[PDB]
Design a protein around this ligand. Structure first.
Ligand SMILES: *C(=O)/C=C/c1ccc(O)cc1
Length: 125
């Protein structure tokens, strides 16, 4: 299959062309969000890290419903900024907690290929 690497320069492009099942093939977490942070895609990998049902979180807001612990300047702050600037490509470590067992992860946010969406890539560290 296609084993896209975390941090691939053109990761967004690749994910854009993916066909059914391909996203859940990534070894790391992948979440696609709209401008307000509403979840459009959520893969198996992320669900295995968070305990969340990928189907259930769809349509829910990432920062306000599912991942409230990311509602901070360090995460949500960077997101909104990148959204308002049309430029989003940053990497930082973060601790997921509050709605899950405290877990250290490496996060990569990047604007999507075309359209108005954004990607949040996650993997445990
Ligand atoms: C903070 O509350 C983190 C929670 C969280 C992050 C990412 C997910 O996919 C699900 C929950």
């Amino acid at each position: 299959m296609e084993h896209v690497a975390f941090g691939s320069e053109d990761i967004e492009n690749t994910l854009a062309k993916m066909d059914d099942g391909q996203l859940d093939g990534l070894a790391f977490g992948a979440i696609q969000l709209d401008g307000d942070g509403n979840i459009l895609q959520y893969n198996a990998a992320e669900g295995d890290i968070t305990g969340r049902d990928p189907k259930q979180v769809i349509g829910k807001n990432f920062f306000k419903d599912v991942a409230p612990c990311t509602d901070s300047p360090e995460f949500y702050g960077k997101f909104k900024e990148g959204v308002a600037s049309g430029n989003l490509n940053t990497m930082f470590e973060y601790t997921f907690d509050q709605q899950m067992t405290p877990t250290k992860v490496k996060v990569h946010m990047k604007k999507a290929l075309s359209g108005d969406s954004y990607w949040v890539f996650v993997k445990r560290v």
